Amino acid sequence: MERIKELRDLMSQSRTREILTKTTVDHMAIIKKYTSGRQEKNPALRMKWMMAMKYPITADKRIMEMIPERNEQGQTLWSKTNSDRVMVSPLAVTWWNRNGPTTSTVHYPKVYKTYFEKVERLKHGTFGPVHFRNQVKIRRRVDINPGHADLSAKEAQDVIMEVVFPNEVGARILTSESQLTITKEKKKELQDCKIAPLMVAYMLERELVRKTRFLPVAGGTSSVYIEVLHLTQGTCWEQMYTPGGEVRNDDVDQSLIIAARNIVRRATVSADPLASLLEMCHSTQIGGVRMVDILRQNPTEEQAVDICKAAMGLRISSSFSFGGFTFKRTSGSSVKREEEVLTGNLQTLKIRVHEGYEEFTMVGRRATAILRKATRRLIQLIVSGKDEQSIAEAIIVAMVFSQEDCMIKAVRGDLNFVNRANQRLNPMHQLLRHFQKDAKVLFQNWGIEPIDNVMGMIGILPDMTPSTEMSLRGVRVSKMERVVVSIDRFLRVRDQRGNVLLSPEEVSETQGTEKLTITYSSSMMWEINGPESVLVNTYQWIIRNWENVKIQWSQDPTMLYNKMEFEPFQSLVPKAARGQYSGFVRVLFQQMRDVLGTFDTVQIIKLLPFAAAPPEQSRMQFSSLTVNVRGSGMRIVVRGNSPVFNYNKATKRLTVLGKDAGALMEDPDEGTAGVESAVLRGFLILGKENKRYGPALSINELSNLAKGEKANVLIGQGDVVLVMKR
Amino acid sequence: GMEDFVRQCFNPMIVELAEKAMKEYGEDPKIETNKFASICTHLEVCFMYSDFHFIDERGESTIILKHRFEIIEGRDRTMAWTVVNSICNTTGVEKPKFLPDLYDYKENRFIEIGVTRREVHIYYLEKANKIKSEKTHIHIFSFTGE
Amino acid sequence: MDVNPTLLFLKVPVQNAISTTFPYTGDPPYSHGTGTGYTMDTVNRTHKYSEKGKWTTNTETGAPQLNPIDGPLPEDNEPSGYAQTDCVLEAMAFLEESHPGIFENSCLETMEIVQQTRVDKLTQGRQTYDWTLNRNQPAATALANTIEVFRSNGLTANESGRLIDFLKDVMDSMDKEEMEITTHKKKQRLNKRSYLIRALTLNTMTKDAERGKLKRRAIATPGMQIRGFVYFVEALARSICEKLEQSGLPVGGNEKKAKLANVVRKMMTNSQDTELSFTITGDNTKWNENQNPRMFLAMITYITRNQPEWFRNVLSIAPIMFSNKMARLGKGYMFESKSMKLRTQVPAEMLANIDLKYFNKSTREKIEKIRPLLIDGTASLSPGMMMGMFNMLSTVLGVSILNLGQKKYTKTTYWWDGLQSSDDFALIVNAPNHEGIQAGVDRFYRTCKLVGINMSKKKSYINRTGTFEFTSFFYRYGFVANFSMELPSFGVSGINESADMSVGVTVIKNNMINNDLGPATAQMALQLFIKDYRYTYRCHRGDTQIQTRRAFELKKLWEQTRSKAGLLVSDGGPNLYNIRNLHIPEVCLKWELMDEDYQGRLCNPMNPFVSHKEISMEYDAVATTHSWIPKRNRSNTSQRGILEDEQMYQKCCNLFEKFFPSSSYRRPVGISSMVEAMVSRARIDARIDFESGRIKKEEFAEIMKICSTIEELRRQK
RNA sequence: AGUAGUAACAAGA
RNA sequence: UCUGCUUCUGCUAU
RNA sequence: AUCUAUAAUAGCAGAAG
Ligand SMILES: *O[C@H]1[C@@H](O)[C@H](n2cnc3c(N)ncnc32)O[C@@H]1COP(=O)(O)OP(=O)(O)OP(=O)(O)OC[C@H]1O[C@@H](n2c[n+](C)c3c(=O)[nH]c(N)nc32)[C@H](O)[C@@H]1O
Ligand SMILES: Nc1ccn([C@@H]2O[C@H](COP(=O)(O)CP(=O)(O)OP(=O)(O)O)[C@@H](O)[C@H]2O)c(=O)n1
Ligand SMILES: [Mg+2]
Ligand SMILES: [Mg+2]
């Protein structure tokens, strides 16, 4: 009523009518941003340049009736300006704050509930000690605002639009049941709201919309730990801290899986993996809560979590998760090998392929299925879902799980298998995400076969239609428990019958990052840390204890090789390599103790962790040794410096992965003659090339020489040198 | 020549509405003249299907006040969806998945209007299948009288 | 003892103390006078690097244009603009061969972008050349002026609201006999050539507040006829850059550091053990002046193969317009007579018909060298990109040259890869010995020469792989922290008291997170920010003696308050911030400690220092009284005619928001006029209200009658 | 004069 | 007749 | 597990090229 009379008043005139008629709604935003003047620039200088003035503030003329022109000292609080605006001093703000009409109904706590949640989390937080340590912060994407657990950012924005502006949503429809529930609750909670709809929308954006950022993180990546990242994680220190509220069960499950995988991987290297594993789970906390107390009350299905539960005499599920479905192997076995495959979009990538026939019960909430499969082959899939969308979900999950070459070749479009920061993504998760948006091509390229119509069931066709004649190549539709276990010294989980149910070999090798901070209390607070931390701390321990380590490396080397301090390192060495590597390094060290004058402290420190394995004999000469860091094999070069281990001869400070490890003092028996006895197995390097002895041959070409014979070898980073066979 | 015919065959308001409708999505009325004529015919059928129909103060339809029909066609996408959303939030009728042509307050239902050149069976069936919502009304006219 | 800070590098590596070498505590250098000198010098350098090219005269503008494409191969190591089209096409072909499907997928996403983008996107620009006024204007103002002139000239496809329809309007405007400019009411008429020269013009200004440079340089800003095409081309190039592992764009910040570290890490992993690995920290010299628009057209034509023809055309228009672009000379010069003690301004438009006696040696040489290109106060500049106008496309070209470094293309024992961010680049070369490294470096340098890329020899260096610099990111076996670069972000921002508190504390916290700001230095930064804040806003602690106009009210409020710890710092309260609570705002930090009456005054719903919106009943305010609005002085020219246009614009927009509640939360869409949309909304709202039962017979009749009156007024003025 | 540094300020209307 | 383009980050809501 | 993005309100400020 008011507004229509207002509009008629503006249309009665001439220029406003021409504006209202000759301006579409799309151009209204342009004319709304339309500004006249010299714009503005450097407002900090302006603020310093106007706060010394008398009236730097502009307010509405209504303030005449609220703020007096003068206080009890005759200082002017506002001055009329030659319009509805009025120039005002900050003294007016302070006079309102000390004399203005007060009230018991303020909207600040409700509109800004999330900030008060931060306040409450800090108030009830628990502070532990500060530990100064070599910190390895990795840059990754984390949550700055957690948002609603159910909704995504798009869904949260849709909910906000439907709640605040119901008649302006356009063609959009809320599809999810969580969306509808939250919309109902917010519309119920916001009737008779005296706040403007814009600020209500922004309050709901703070409450519901999830927001992420790339940050350098150590410790937990959950939003309750990211909000206090400045307080808990430093350059050289970790502040033990636990937020005050309630933890999300999802984050607890994730961090438990991470800790269990790290613990099992480190335990496999020990000479008594069972006792080692028990000690670690007894000395581990997850978000402030003891790991054993979590393991006694957490129903998480995972291989390493089940191994941890079995070692402490608990009932396990012997099941895992994949694509939202719970998988339980009923019969069969498998091993895991790395296989390079080419996808439908010409992207080559390695997948962990499981060799061996096996059978699974795949339980979802809206679907269920029996699967039988072999090495990259879907032998049989009997799905029993409720709705055809759930049936399609389960079929897609089973085709991806089968690791069929048809599935790998069905990839079309711009499917990336790397992160935006060029980090490796899980290929199976990427294929699942790709086919869950549209699996038309997968259904076409899967294949069809005629049905014999057994048991009354009916098969489904690539068009998601039921057909009694044909179906997919192995797919059939249908109309529709924690066991006591044992565990031995080597972490093999037998059943009550005596057949192996789990093994450390079934534990996923992916090195992930915890959502809640994992706290380890032992001699080495880094023992169950990530690979970069483990490498840095292993070398830092070696050079920090270099006096006793150096005295022991000569008297009883076997005692030194057997130290626990090298076992977190050995879990990063590839298994098949360990023994060989060890043998190599040990032979080097022995031929180093036999040749007087050849003593290189850097070489011993470099190769000492690799000697921690039972040495297997071999005639191979290694120019490098591999350690698995985040899915990639980093090479430590036997001679000289490298990008994972570089000793600066000038500063004398060893650097491992860019993190300083410390300085090496002056060893009197350092070998300045130039001879090297710990680079090649059975060869003393006597210096640079001598053209007398012929051309340079390869490292792996030296096995047919005889003792008392020099040669020129292209051993190193493009360095030709002169060696001789002992 | 189609352009000229349209310009002289229909009212200036219907022609202006058609011009707006094809200008919203980047169509020149001088180039695509058959779509110009199709849209003009659609708008004219809708504005005749609507006009001269009211609901009196007791609640039944009388032809001579509360208009019987709400015109959804011939509006901007935003204004059309605003009208549809307001009708849905007031009367509690299911939201159509696509923009309809009219709304019947008396029958309280969205009407999808079609003006076909081909058979009405084919056209009707196609439209119905596409909509797949057994709540939207589908009334198909043709130039033959069927 | 003589103190030498540089001697600290004898023990601390330069990277681990790189922050010392950034003197960002002093003021940056500004320009004082005109930019005509830098503009003329830029044009002359661009024509010098391409002087062996072919000269032609433009049949449409009459401007002399230089074409250095396929010119004579360079004979020295001076910068050359002689890019060979076959080598550029080969680089594109091999980039597509090494990443199958990159251009196809990029063109699909860019087709979606081109079809959905609104003309409002153009308003997201800064100061824009406005051909209607021949001056710099805000982007929204320039766009509105362009739309008004186009409409008064019968060009109204932009009414669709799509950017591509406005581009069609621009295309059709470039074919009119005369353009009508209606000022305030003087009716000017540009002809075809004059309008065309104004449409292909980029205004030139001098870049101010720039670190690391002794001498100033010129920047350019294009008009509205260029910006839509450049936006579409840059969107395509961004889609391409997103799919390339060597691109340092459009990734930035922590994500960029992570990508660079991971990519260099993978590169060092791929290199075999027996190989020699070297890294070139490299800059390219005269990057924008040697990027030819014709090569951008060739690249776009190869990228858009087998695409619809409308898409290729709309993507080809930007390189065409940039190939025929004019650079406006600027403000001109200023002349002084000491004996007569007078000074005068000489515009640039009279720099072709002026006597050369007035100028010094170098300026006279500049004018003599540039005079053949002068038309209507602009200079013809066919070669060059005119300062970062195609950052992402030039990034694609550099990445193609990097991609040419695999062993399948070098066909030798050496190979190379690296990182490319527009002009900056890090090149990792691998080879079995030093001669192979030299050969790979020579081959990369010469291949870059073939495509118009000139490696800066004086700014680039090479060392064993492991340390380098890329886009001011220093990598010593990993990227190091450089706190000095973020130093100008500390301080009072000048928004208001609340926002300045929030920004100061948040900046301190984020610098602890990202830039290795230690805890003790963070506490001291907090203390220094609180000092600067209290000085700026005259809000020193209530129980102090500093004398200011505000101090009496602050003392009264202090003595009035039981719980002093609850008062905000802007109210003369204490500073309760520490490392613990940097992430918590100030009103929430001390909400529990506030006195009830002070709390109900600070957060009063009828706060008079913030704006109130009508529902004369108004919504309750939520913000505190420290969220006031600073007076913005905007008062001496003839451009005062737009103040009334803008006032009436604001009146209309507030009325529209009274009719459309979500228009200020999300951008509204619609081809209908404002009055039509508002009347239809009023009608449907009155209908669903009378139906649902909020209004009666008579109010509904009155609303419908006012609507009919407005509709007959819009049809009948 | 001074600021300053490749062109300006040392008020303008 | 005078702070451009691009990218990231932070803050705010005429 | 993903997540500039199975994404798109705008303005200002800092940095980089
Ligand atoms: O966030 C990660 C993880 O913590 C989380 N997760 C794992 N388990 C749970 C549960 N139980 N509840 C909630 N969240 C859970 O999901 C992410 C998975 O970790 P990630 O390292 O990314 O992948 P992972 O290494 O686990 O492998 P993935 O592809 O997810 O497969 C999981 C599981 O499936 C086994 N598997 C796959 N295939 C194709 C198999 C096969 O053919 N034969 C057999 N016997 N097993 C197969 C994988 O080996 C894993 O066991
Ligand atoms: N503000 C900026 C700074 C840079 N750029 C873009 O970055 C390039 C290199 O700038 P640069 O500053 O590295 C060129 P410089 O090293 O000074 O000299 P040289 O050319 O003789 O080597 C420019 O040519 C523009 O494309 C920009 O668009 N805006
Ligand atoms: Mg560089
Ligand atoms: Mg440079």
UniProtKB/TrEMBL annotation, chain A:
<dbReference type="GO" id="GO:0039657">
    <property type="term" value="P:symbiont-mediated suppression of host gene expression"/>
</dbReference>
<dbReference type="GO" id="GO:0075526">
    <property type="term" value="P:cap snatching"/>
</dbReference>
<comment type="function">
    <text>Plays an essential role in transcription initiation and cap-stealing mechanism, in which cellular capped pre-mRNAs are used to generate primers for viral transcription. Recognizes and binds the 7-methylguanosine-containing cap of the target pre-RNA which is subsequently cleaved after 10-13 nucleotides by the viral protein PA. Plays a role in the initiation of the viral genome replication and modulates the activity of the ribonucleoprotein (RNP) complex.</text>
</comment>
<dbReference type="Pfam" id="PF20949">
    <property type="entry name" value="Flu_PB2_3rd"/>
</dbReference>
<dbReference type="InterPro" id="IPR049114">
    <property type="entry name" value="Flu_PB2_6th"/>
</dbReference>
<feature type="domain" description="Influenza RNA polymerase PB2 CAP binding">
    <location>
        <begin position="317"/>
        <end position="519"/>
    </location>
</feature>
<keyword id="KW-1190">Host gene expression shutoff by virus</keyword>
<keyword id="KW-1262">Eukaryotic host gene expression shutoff by virus</keyword>
<protein>
    <recommendedName>
        <fullName>Polymerase basic protein 2</fullName>
    </recommendedName>
</protein>
<dbReference type="Pfam" id="PF20951">
    <property type="entry name" value="Flu_PB2_6th"/>
</dbReference>
<dbReference type="InterPro" id="IPR049111">
    <property type="entry name" value="Flu_PB2_middle"/>
</dbReference>
<dbReference type="GO" id="GO:0039694">
    <property type="term" value="P:viral RNA genome replication"/>
</dbReference>
<feature type="domain" description="Influenza RNA polymerase PB2 middle">
    <location>
        <begin position="104"/>
        <end position="245"/>
    </location>
</feature>
<dbReference type="GO" id="GO:0033650">
    <property type="term" value="C:host cell mitochondrion"/>
</dbReference>
<feature type="domain" description="Influenza RNA polymerase PB2 N-terminal region">
    <location>
        <begin position="1"/>
        <end position="36"/>
    </location>
</feature>
UniProtKB/TrEMBL annotation, chain B:
<feature type="binding site">
    <location>
        <position position="112"/>
    </location>
    <ligand>
        <name>Mn(2+) 1</name>
    </ligand>
</feature>
<feature type="binding site">
    <location>
        <position position="73"/>
    </location>
    <ligand>
        <name>Mg(2+) 3</name>
    </ligand>
</feature>
<protein>
    <recommendedName>
        <fullName>Polymerase acidic protein</fullName>
    </recommendedName>
</protein>
<comment type="function">
    <text>Plays an essential role in viral RNA transcription and replication by forming the heterotrimeric polymerase complex together with PB1 and PB2 subunits. The complex transcribes viral mRNAs by using a unique mechanism called cap-snatching. It consists in the hijacking and cleavage of host capped pre-mRNAs. These short capped RNAs are then used as primers for viral mRNAs. The PB2 subunit is responsible for the binding of the 5' cap of cellular pre-mRNAs which are subsequently cleaved after 10-13 nucleotides by the PA subunit that carries the endonuclease activity.</text>
</comment>
<feature type="binding site">
    <location>
        <position position="101"/>
    </location>
    <ligand>
        <name>Mg(2+) 1</name>
    </ligand>
</feature>
<feature type="binding site">
    <location>
        <position position="113"/>
    </location>
    <ligand>
        <name>Mg(2+) 1</name>
    </ligand>
</feature>
<feature type="binding site">
    <location>
        <position position="112"/>
    </location>
    <ligand>
        <name>Mg(2+) 3</name>
    </ligand>
</feature>
<feature type="binding site">
    <location>
        <position position="73"/>
    </location>
    <ligand>
        <name>Mg(2+) 2</name>
    </ligand>
</feature>
<feature type="binding site">
    <location>
        <position position="113"/>
    </location>
    <ligand>
        <name>Mn(2+) 1</name>
    </ligand>
</feature>
<comment type="similarity">
    <text>Belongs to the influenza viruses PA family.</text>
</comment>
<feature type="binding site">
    <location>
        <position position="101"/>
    </location>
    <ligand>
        <name>Mg(2+) 3</name>
    </ligand>
</feature>
<feature type="binding site">
    <location>
        <position position="42"/>
    </location>
    <ligand>
        <name>Mg(2+) 1</name>
    </ligand>
</feature>
<feature type="binding site">
    <location>
        <position position="101"/>
    </location>
    <ligand>
        <name>Mn(2+) 2</name>
    </ligand>
</feature>
<comment type="subunit">
    <text>Influenza RNA polymerase is composed of three subunits: PB1, PB2 and PA. Interacts (via C-terminus) with PB1 (via N-terminus).</text>
</comment>
<feature type="binding site">
    <location>
        <position position="101"/>
    </location>
    <ligand>
        <name>Mn(2+) 1</name>
    </ligand>
</feature>
TrEMBL record, chain C:
<keyword id="KW-1195">Viral transcription</keyword>
<feature type="binding site">
    <location>
        <position position="469"/>
    </location>
    <ligand>
        <name>Mg(2+) 1</name>
    </ligand>
</feature>
<keyword id="KW-0547">Nucleotide-binding</keyword>
<dbReference type="InterPro" id="IPR001407">
    <property type="entry name" value="RNA_pol_PB1_influenza"/>
</dbReference>
<dbReference type="GO" id="GO:0042025">
    <property type="term" value="C:host cell nucleus"/>
</dbReference>
<dbReference type="GO" id="GO:0000166">
    <property type="term" value="F:nucleotide binding"/>
</dbReference>
<protein>
    <recommendedName>
        <fullName>RNA-directed RNA polymerase catalytic subunit</fullName>
        <ecNumber>2.7.7.48</ecNumber>
    </recommendedName>
</protein>
<comment type="subunit">
    <text>Influenza RNA polymerase is composed of three subunits: PB1, PB2 and PA. Interacts (via N-terminus) with PA (via C-terminus). Interacts (via C-terminus) with PB2 (via N-terminus); this interaction is essential for transcription initiation.</text>
</comment>
<feature type="binding site">
    <location>
        <position position="424"/>
    </location>
    <ligand>
        <name>Mg(2+) 4</name>
    </ligand>
</feature>
<dbReference type="Pfam" id="PF00602">
    <property type="entry name" value="Flu_PB1"/>
</dbReference>
<comment type="similarity">
    <text>Belongs to the influenza viruses polymerase PB1 family.</text>
</comment>
<dbReference type="GO" id="GO:0003723">
    <property type="term" value="F:RNA binding"/>
</dbReference>
<keyword id="KW-0945">Host-virus interaction</keyword>
<feature type="binding site">
    <location>
        <position position="282"/>
    </location>
    <ligand>
        <name>Mg(2+) 1</name>
    </ligand>
</feature>
<keyword id="KW-0808">Transferase</keyword>
